[PDB]
Amino acid sequence: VRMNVLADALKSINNAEKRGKRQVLIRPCSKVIVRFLTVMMKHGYIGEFEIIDDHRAGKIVVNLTGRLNKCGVISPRFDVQLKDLEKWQNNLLPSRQFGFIVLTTSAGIMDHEEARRKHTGGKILGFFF
Amino acid sequence: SGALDVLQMKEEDVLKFLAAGTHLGGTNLDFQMEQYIYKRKSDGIYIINLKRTWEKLLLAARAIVAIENPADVSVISSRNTGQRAVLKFAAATGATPIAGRFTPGTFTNQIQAAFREPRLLVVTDPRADHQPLTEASYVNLPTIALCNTDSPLRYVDIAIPCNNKGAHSVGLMWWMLAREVLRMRGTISREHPWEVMPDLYFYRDPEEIEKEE
Amino acid sequence: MQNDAGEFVDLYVPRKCSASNRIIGAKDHASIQMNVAEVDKVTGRFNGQFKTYAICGAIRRMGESDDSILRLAKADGIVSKN
Amino acid sequence: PLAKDLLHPSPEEEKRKHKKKRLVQSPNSYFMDVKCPGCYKITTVFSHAQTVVLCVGCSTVLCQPTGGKARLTEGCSFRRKQ
Amino acid sequence: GRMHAPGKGLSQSALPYRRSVPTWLKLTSDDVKEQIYKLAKKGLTPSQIGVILRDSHGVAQVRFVTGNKILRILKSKGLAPDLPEDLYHLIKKAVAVRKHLERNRKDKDAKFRLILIESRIHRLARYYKTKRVLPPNWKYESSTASALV
Amino acid sequence: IVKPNGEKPDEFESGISQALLELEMNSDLKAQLRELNITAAKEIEVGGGRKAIIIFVPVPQLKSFQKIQVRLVRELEKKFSGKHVVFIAQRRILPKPTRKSRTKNKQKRPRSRTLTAVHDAILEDLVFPSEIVGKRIRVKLDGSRLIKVHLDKAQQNNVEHKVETFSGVYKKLTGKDVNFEFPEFQ
RNA sequence: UAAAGUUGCUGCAGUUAAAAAGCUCGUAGUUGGAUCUUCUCGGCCGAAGCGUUUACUUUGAAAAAA
């Protein structure tokens, strides 16, 4: 069945970005998906998106500026301490000058740079570059 | 056209298009040609939106005029219908025509005798003119095509949606493209009708040739 | 692009597809750079200006070059709003 | 087609799609009010009725169940609600 | 896809966005509740009750009128079935299959389908046991099966 | 009539109560309003110098106000000139339980006193005549949220002007930017 | 031991090179859709510092030397 709806959302975004689509439809939405998309948007990778409110579970139409090389999920959500963050950056990110790792920490859902800035580890959700 | 009134469609162009069956597409529709059609008739024929055809024609004319050396535009036609049309177009505007057989490697083989390096390519039918279309993928050659409802749009960068099965439609399309190119270049007349009538571009089969003679 | 001092060190900044915002490779021979002649408002003549659209060969190979160029021209005001 | 406004689609296309595949799922069914010549009280009927609903004042039926939309009977005038 | 079938058919109800009572619908909450009570007195299961209300009485969904589900209404009034309707329907389907099998012993396909139905019954009963809808000792057997119908 | 949480009415609440009382004394709606009473009111600026009134109402009686809502707003707008009036039920929001808390509530929070459910309900009753037929939340590049609420097109003709008074009231008592539009396919 | 991404968690493979059970059910296992913004009053005006739980994360204490 469908588990880890964040994985499906990120896979759909990746497939649409590779295909050159300007908009991608994501369903179902969730708090985690919206937070991940906001983290992406704050870094200028996806741009605006709209949450279609169904009375069962939302959908999301995401505009796709062409700036995304790859968006991916990490499963299972491994616990990431602050000292272990650099190994994950080396493994997942294409460079140390760009690319982000997204973590759910007690302070919210945030990139690895912000979590390092706030001295908090968490569980790794995914990455995008 | 740019919503400009001076570049807007007139009644004479509509009458010419309807006379020559330009709006009459085929019985099959390409999924990338859908945006240019308007409806399907009861006999399974796709009516082509004439305003879309005019807009594509004017965009293609803008593309052609932007090239300063008119010899660098190459107009190609392998089907017998479009040979006279492309010859007359080259005579009227200044492009380089290739009627009949198109030699493979005309653009990619720099050693060959008839090796020409155009900057724009205009073809009569992407299906029949697939060889220059494929060769335009090697030399950075943008291409304009007179596409039908069924004709594929691969390597076709400006497709003009028009009937190209019939000789009248091909001739009128090439005539109108030449007219618009000469109009935006500054020569000929925009307010009053062009000297050359569309029937000069029409292809006549030997039966019509012997009946008229 | 820039180093710490701020000087631009790259050999060149490559072109980006107007339809996908993707970099056009230096050996992508299918890619085009179309110039569409800008036309004066009242007479209808080629006044010397033009709009440039760079289209990558990947978009052309799948047939969306025509739709992409039409959308770009429409967004530029070259094509009337239909 | 590499640029499709999924936010605002054509009403024809949403009427074309499956009841679930639409942006917001809506049923293809509706409720009608059926009037019989000899009875003066309206009776609401589901379009896709699964049961043989009878009229209390007339000996005739209002609709036959089928595989899809119910088969309304001649002599009863239907008016779809909403 | 289906639990014991290779099919993946996409066919179901599509509730409308609006959750309000229909404009045409005039019966108040108590009228629909008494309609439900009388239909339950006739012996109809909540599925049949909802079908009849939708087909004949013009209610789109009683949950948007009375604010409660049909089974919740019956349980509140205390005339709900002893065991849930879907489990009972699976039970009676298995009973019919067993009755057919005990004459047609060569029917190996019926044996396969009986295994499938019994598995569905076991899963449903386990779920209803975690929810405390059934007594924890509730066990379906090949002997005390037709008595539950 | 007005019985606020502190039970002490103010001047505008008292004026609204007296207007409703005079409606009770002499009107066609005396029968309904005898068993009816409101709980609060306040005056806010929906846009610029424009003003609007938020008639707060007890939830059990909110439905009782709906059936008479159109005539009630008609009379209140007649009384108060060009000031719009919107009837909203008074809904309390139980705070989301946290790791740090006090032993003051030993029962689970109902999923109707949550902020989400209460705000959705407020949007629903903010306008009784027109029903939402779909809403979409647009997230801008700065992370802000803008709700867009679609109303019935067949009921557009009487609530075009009340738009931007819905927006002001919602921005006041919810703190969220919401626009209201009318699509075609209902 | 590295080379061995030729033991593959990172990180391999399984159509034809070695390879997916003949097929289905099923327990343990593994995985699991959306959704919830100090109180006995108190040492210059006189203290809340979990008065519903784990995982996780961060801190502190404690933790031989070599």
CSV table of N, CA and C in Angstrom, one decimal, chain B residues 1-4 6-7 31-32 35-36 49 51-52 55-56 59 62-63 65-66 68 119-120 136-144 153-159 183-184 186 190, chain C residues 15 28-47 50 53 55 57 60-67 69-70 73-74 77-82:
chain,number,residue,atom,x,y,z
B,1,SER,N,1.0,38.2,-34.0
B,1,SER,CA,0.6,39.5,-34.3
B,1,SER,C,0.8,40.5,-33.2
B,2,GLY,N,0.7,40.0,-32.0
B,2,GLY,CA,0.9,40.9,-30.8
B,2,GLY,C,-0.4,41.7,-30.5
B,3,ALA,N,-1.6,41.3,-30.9
B,3,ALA,CA,-2.8,42.0,-30.7
B,3,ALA,C,-2.8,43.3,-31.5
B,4,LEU,N,-1.8,43.6,-32.3
B,4,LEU,CA,-1.8,44.8,-33.1
B,4,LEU,C,-2.9,44.8,-34.1
B,6,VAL,N,-2.9,46.5,-36.9
B,6,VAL,CA,-2.3,46.5,-38.2
B,6,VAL,C,-2.0,45.1,-38.7
B,7,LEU,N,-1.6,44.2,-37.7
B,7,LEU,CA,-1.3,42.8,-38.0
B,7,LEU,C,-2.4,41.9,-37.8
B,31,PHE,N,-1.3,14.8,-30.6
B,31,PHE,CA,-1.5,15.4,-29.3
B,31,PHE,C,-0.9,16.7,-29.1
B,32,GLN,N,0.2,17.0,-29.8
B,32,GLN,CA,0.8,18.3,-29.7
B,32,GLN,C,0.3,19.3,-30.8
B,35,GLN,N,-3.8,22.0,-29.6
B,35,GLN,CA,-4.0,23.4,-29.2
B,35,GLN,C,-4.4,24.3,-30.4
B,36,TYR,N,-4.2,23.8,-31.6
B,36,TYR,CA,-4.5,24.6,-32.8
B,36,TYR,C,-5.8,24.3,-33.5
B,49,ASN,N,-8.3,26.0,-36.2
B,49,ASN,CA,-8.6,27.4,-35.8
B,49,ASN,C,-7.8,28.3,-36.7
B,51,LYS,N,-7.5,31.6,-36.6
B,51,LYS,CA,-6.7,32.6,-35.9
B,51,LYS,C,-5.4,32.0,-35.4
B,52,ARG,N,-5.4,30.8,-34.9
B,52,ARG,CA,-4.2,30.2,-34.5
B,52,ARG,C,-3.2,30.0,-35.7
B,55,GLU,N,-1.7,33.4,-36.3
B,55,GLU,CA,-0.8,33.8,-35.3
B,55,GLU,C,0.5,33.0,-35.5
B,56,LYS,N,0.5,31.7,-35.8
B,56,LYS,CA,1.7,31.0,-36.1
B,56,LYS,C,2.3,31.5,-37.4
B,59,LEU,N,4.2,34.7,-36.4
B,59,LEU,CA,5.4,34.3,-35.6
B,59,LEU,C,6.5,33.8,-36.5
B,62,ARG,N,8.0,36.6,-38.4
B,62,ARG,CA,9.0,37.3,-37.5
B,62,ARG,C,10.3,36.6,-37.4
B,63,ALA,N,10.2,35.2,-37.2
B,63,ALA,CA,11.4,34.4,-37.1
B,63,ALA,C,12.2,34.5,-38.4
B,65,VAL,N,12.2,37.0,-40.8
B,65,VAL,CA,12.6,38.3,-41.1
B,65,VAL,C,13.8,38.7,-40.2
B,66,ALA,N,13.9,38.2,-39.0
B,66,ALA,CA,15.0,38.5,-38.1
B,66,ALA,C,16.3,38.1,-38.6
B,68,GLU,N,19.2,38.4,-41.0
B,68,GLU,CA,19.6,39.5,-41.9
B,68,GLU,C,20.0,39.1,-43.3
B,119,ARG,N,20.7,29.2,-41.4
B,119,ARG,CA,20.4,29.6,-40.1
B,119,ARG,C,19.0,29.4,-39.7
B,120,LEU,N,18.1,29.3,-40.7
B,120,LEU,CA,16.7,28.9,-40.5
B,120,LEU,C,16.3,27.9,-41.5
B,136,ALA,N,18.7,19.0,-38.8
B,136,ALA,CA,18.7,20.3,-38.0
B,136,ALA,C,19.0,20.0,-36.6
B,137,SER,N,19.1,18.8,-36.1
B,137,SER,CA,19.5,18.4,-34.8
B,137,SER,C,21.0,18.4,-34.6
B,138,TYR,N,21.7,18.5,-35.7
B,138,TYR,CA,23.2,18.5,-35.6
B,138,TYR,C,23.9,19.8,-35.8
B,139,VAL,N,23.1,20.8,-36.3
B,139,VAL,CA,23.8,22.1,-36.7
B,139,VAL,C,23.1,23.3,-36.1
B,140,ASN,N,22.3,23.1,-35.0
B,140,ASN,CA,21.6,24.1,-34.3
B,140,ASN,C,20.7,24.9,-35.2
B,141,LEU,N,19.9,24.2,-35.9
B,141,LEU,CA,19.0,24.8,-37.0
B,141,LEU,C,17.6,24.9,-36.5
B,142,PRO,N,17.1,26.0,-36.1
B,142,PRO,CA,15.7,26.2,-35.8
B,142,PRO,C,14.8,26.0,-37.1
B,143,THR,N,13.6,25.4,-36.9
B,143,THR,CA,12.8,25.0,-38.0
B,143,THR,C,11.4,25.5,-37.9
B,144,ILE,N,10.9,25.9,-39.0
B,144,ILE,CA,9.4,26.2,-39.2
B,144,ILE,C,8.8,25.2,-40.1
B,153,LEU,N,5.6,16.9,-34.3
B,153,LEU,CA,6.2,18.2,-34.1
B,153,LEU,C,7.6,18.1,-33.5
B,154,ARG,N,8.3,16.9,-33.7
B,154,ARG,CA,9.6,16.7,-33.3
B,154,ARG,C,10.6,17.6,-34.1
B,155,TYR,N,11.4,18.4,-33.5
B,155,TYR,CA,12.4,19.3,-34.1
B,155,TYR,C,11.7,20.4,-34.8
B,156,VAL,N,10.4,20.5,-34.7
B,156,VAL,CA,9.6,21.6,-35.3
B,156,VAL,C,9.4,22.7,-34.3
B,157,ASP,N,10.1,23.8,-34.4
B,157,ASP,CA,10.1,24.8,-33.4
B,157,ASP,C,9.0,25.9,-33.6
B,158,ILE,N,8.5,26.1,-34.8
B,158,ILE,CA,7.3,26.9,-35.1
B,158,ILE,C,6.5,26.1,-36.1
B,159,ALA,N,5.4,25.5,-35.7
B,159,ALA,CA,4.5,24.7,-36.6
B,159,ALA,C,3.4,25.6,-36.9
B,183,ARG,N,6.2,42.0,-46.2
B,183,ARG,CA,5.6,43.1,-45.5
B,183,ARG,C,6.4,43.6,-44.3
B,184,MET,N,6.8,42.7,-43.4
B,184,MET,CA,7.6,43.1,-42.3
B,184,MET,C,9.0,43.5,-42.7
B,186,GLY,N,9.6,45.4,-45.0
B,186,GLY,CA,9.5,46.8,-45.5
B,186,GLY,C,9.1,46.9,-46.9
B,190,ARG,N,1.3,46.6,-47.4
B,190,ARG,CA,0.4,46.1,-46.4
B,190,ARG,C,-1.0,46.6,-46.5
C,15,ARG,N,24.3,29.2,-21.3
C,15,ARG,CA,23.0,29.6,-21.6
C,15,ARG,C,22.0,28.6,-20.9
C,28,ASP,N,25.7,20.4,-27.0
C,28,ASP,CA,24.3,20.1,-27.4
C,28,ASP,C,24.0,20.8,-28.7
C,29,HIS,N,24.1,20.1,-29.8
C,29,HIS,CA,24.0,20.6,-31.1
C,29,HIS,C,22.6,20.7,-31.6
C,30,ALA,N,21.6,20.0,-30.9
C,30,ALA,CA,20.2,20.2,-31.3
C,30,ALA,C,19.6,21.4,-30.8
C,31,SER,N,20.2,22.1,-29.8
C,31,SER,CA,19.6,23.3,-29.2
C,31,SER,C,19.6,24.5,-30.2
C,32,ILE,N,18.6,25.3,-30.1
C,32,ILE,CA,18.5,26.5,-31.0
C,32,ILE,C,18.5,27.7,-30.2
C,33,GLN,N,18.7,28.8,-30.9
C,33,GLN,CA,18.6,30.2,-30.4
C,33,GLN,C,17.8,31.0,-31.5
C,34,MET,N,16.5,31.0,-31.3
C,34,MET,CA,15.6,31.7,-32.2
C,34,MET,C,15.5,33.2,-31.9
C,35,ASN,N,15.6,34.0,-32.9
C,35,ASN,CA,15.4,35.5,-32.8
C,35,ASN,C,14.0,35.8,-33.5
C,36,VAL,N,13.1,36.4,-32.7
C,36,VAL,CA,11.8,36.7,-33.2
C,36,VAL,C,11.8,38.2,-33.4
C,37,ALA,N,11.5,38.7,-34.6
C,37,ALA,CA,11.6,40.1,-35.0
C,37,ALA,C,10.6,40.9,-34.3
C,38,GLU,N,11.0,41.8,-33.5
C,38,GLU,CA,10.0,42.8,-32.9
C,38,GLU,C,9.5,43.7,-34.0
C,39,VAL,N,8.2,44.0,-33.9
C,39,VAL,CA,7.5,44.8,-35.0
C,39,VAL,C,6.9,46.0,-34.3
C,40,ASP,N,7.1,47.2,-35.0
C,40,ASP,CA,6.6,48.4,-34.5
C,40,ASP,C,5.0,48.4,-34.4
C,41,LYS,N,4.5,49.2,-33.5
C,41,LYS,CA,3.1,49.1,-33.1
C,41,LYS,C,2.1,49.4,-34.2
C,42,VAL,N,2.4,50.5,-34.9
C,42,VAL,CA,1.4,51.0,-35.8
C,42,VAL,C,1.6,50.7,-37.3
C,43,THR,N,2.9,50.5,-37.7
C,43,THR,CA,3.1,50.2,-39.1
C,43,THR,C,3.2,48.7,-39.4
C,44,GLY,N,3.9,47.9,-38.6
C,44,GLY,CA,4.0,46.5,-38.8
C,44,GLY,C,5.3,46.1,-39.4
C,45,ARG,N,6.4,46.9,-39.3
C,45,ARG,CA,7.6,46.6,-39.9
C,45,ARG,C,8.7,46.1,-38.9
C,46,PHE,N,9.7,45.5,-39.4
C,46,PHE,CA,10.8,45.0,-38.5
C,46,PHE,C,11.7,46.2,-38.2
C,47,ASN,N,11.6,46.6,-36.9
C,47,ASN,CA,12.3,47.8,-36.5
C,47,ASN,C,13.7,47.6,-36.0
C,50,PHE,N,14.6,42.4,-31.5
C,50,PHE,CA,14.1,41.1,-31.5
C,50,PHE,C,14.2,40.4,-30.2
C,53,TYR,N,15.1,33.5,-27.8
C,53,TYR,CA,14.7,32.3,-27.1
C,53,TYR,C,15.7,31.2,-27.3
C,55,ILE,N,16.4,27.3,-26.8
C,55,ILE,CA,15.7,26.1,-26.5
C,55,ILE,C,16.6,24.9,-26.6
C,57,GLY,N,18.0,21.0,-26.8
C,57,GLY,CA,17.7,19.9,-27.7
C,57,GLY,C,16.8,18.8,-27.1
C,60,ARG,N,13.3,19.9,-27.8
C,60,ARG,CA,13.0,19.7,-29.2
C,60,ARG,C,12.8,18.3,-29.6
C,61,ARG,N,13.6,17.4,-29.0
C,61,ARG,CA,13.5,16.0,-29.3
C,61,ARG,C,12.2,15.3,-28.9
C,62,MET,N,11.5,15.9,-28.0
C,62,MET,CA,10.2,15.4,-27.5
C,62,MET,C,9.0,16.2,-28.1
C,63,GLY,N,9.2,17.1,-29.0
C,63,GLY,CA,8.2,17.8,-29.7
C,63,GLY,C,7.6,19.0,-29.0
C,64,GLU,N,8.1,19.4,-27.8
C,64,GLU,CA,7.5,20.5,-27.0
C,64,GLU,C,8.2,21.8,-27.3
C,65,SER,N,9.1,21.8,-28.3
C,65,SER,CA,9.8,23.1,-28.6
C,65,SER,C,8.8,24.1,-29.2
C,66,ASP,N,7.8,23.6,-30.0
C,66,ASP,CA,6.9,24.5,-30.6
C,66,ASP,C,5.9,25.1,-29.5
C,67,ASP,N,5.4,24.3,-28.7
C,67,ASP,CA,4.5,24.8,-27.6
C,67,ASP,C,5.3,25.7,-26.7
C,69,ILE,N,7.9,27.6,-27.4
C,69,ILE,CA,8.2,28.9,-28.1
C,69,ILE,C,6.9,29.7,-28.2
C,70,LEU,N,5.8,29.0,-28.4
C,70,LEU,CA,4.5,29.7,-28.5
C,70,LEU,C,4.2,30.4,-27.1
C,73,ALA,N,6.5,33.4,-26.6
C,73,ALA,CA,6.1,34.5,-27.4
C,73,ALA,C,4.8,35.1,-26.8
C,74,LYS,N,3.9,34.3,-26.4
C,74,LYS,CA,2.7,34.8,-25.8
C,74,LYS,C,3.0,35.6,-24.5
C,77,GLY,N,4.2,39.0,-25.3
C,77,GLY,CA,3.4,39.9,-26.1
C,77,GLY,C,3.5,39.8,-27.6
C,78,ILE,N,4.4,38.9,-28.1
C,78,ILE,CA,4.5,38.7,-29.5
C,78,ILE,C,3.3,38.1,-30.1
C,79,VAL,N,2.6,37.2,-29.4
C,79,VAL,CA,1.4,36.5,-29.8
C,79,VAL,C,0.2,37.1,-29.1
C,80,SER,N,-0.8,37.4,-29.9
C,80,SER,CA,-2.0,37.9,-29.3
C,80,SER,C,-2.7,36.9,-28.3
C,81,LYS,N,-3.4,37.5,-27.4
C,81,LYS,CA,-4.1,36.6,-26.4
C,81,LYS,C,-5.3,36.1,-27.0
C,82,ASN,N,-5.3,34.8,-27.3
C,82,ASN,CA,-6.4,34.1,-27.9
C,82,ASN,C,-7.2,33.3,-26.8
